[PDB]
Amino acid sequence: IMRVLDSISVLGVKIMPRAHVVDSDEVGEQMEPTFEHAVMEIYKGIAGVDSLDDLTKWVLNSDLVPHDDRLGQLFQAFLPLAKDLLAPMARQFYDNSMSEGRLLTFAHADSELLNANYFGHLLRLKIPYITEVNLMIRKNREGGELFQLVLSYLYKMYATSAQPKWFGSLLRLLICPWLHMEKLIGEADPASTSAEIGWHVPREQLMGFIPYVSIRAPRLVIEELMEKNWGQYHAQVIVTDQLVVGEPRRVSAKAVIKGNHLPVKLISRFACFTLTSKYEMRLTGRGAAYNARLAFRSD
């Protein structure tokens, strides 16, 4: 789905590239023992097992259906690791990712995001397909396939009790509105329709526009957008870095919103926009903190 969503474009924008997206394994991949390796070494302290394969045999019967008592016993050892070895690092990583841009984050369990104090919209999604057989066909996922099945069961039971909506809602929200914009203003002039919003650091800051959202809409819509006051939306911007390797000279910035957030009905219902975007300043020297405000520039 990431590969498919990467190759999606309607107007002169990219909807969801292979960026602005954090993989579920990416939260715990950057540790000296990974979380997968950490939970691999769990047969120690459990009687009657001496290896990961022995643990998989002991916890899974011939039916490949989990034995309730044994898996419930094993969760009592799994949970302390997920509540002491993962949660602080996950919180730090999520906060860092939120600081340097607005990104869509994928996670395996609801409690994984909740216990890390994630600051964002929480969506629970399910797919029609059977995930267990997909795990059983996949290979080389750092350990045994039966280990993957048991670990998936552990994350499933770890999650809280709440009804997950279907993936169709999010996918339709992400894709469908843009096609109507292509139908309407695809024939229209590009520069006349194009518009964007971003932070505006004042010129008299010796050592700038950092886009926040981009709106593609008919000319009348953006003309209506112009006079709306993008004020009382302050943020502290820390922008110091070597150039991000890129098509244009562009350094990366870090903005944190202190006041409220942008209401979507304040933007429009007649105009589409982008859900995720990275932060980078449009232009060297050192960096500092500037209390900037929003601004709406167009052609």
Binding site: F75, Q76, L79, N117, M157
Partner: peptide, 24 residues
């Protein structure tokens, strides 16, 4: 406000029903 409870035997997923709005 960062500590969270540690539930070792949570309610099984199969023991709930469809949602009455946002309540099962």
């Amino acid at each position: 406000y960062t500590q969270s409870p540690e539930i070792k035997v949570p309610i099984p997923q199969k023991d709930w029903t469809g949602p009455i709005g946002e309540i099962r």
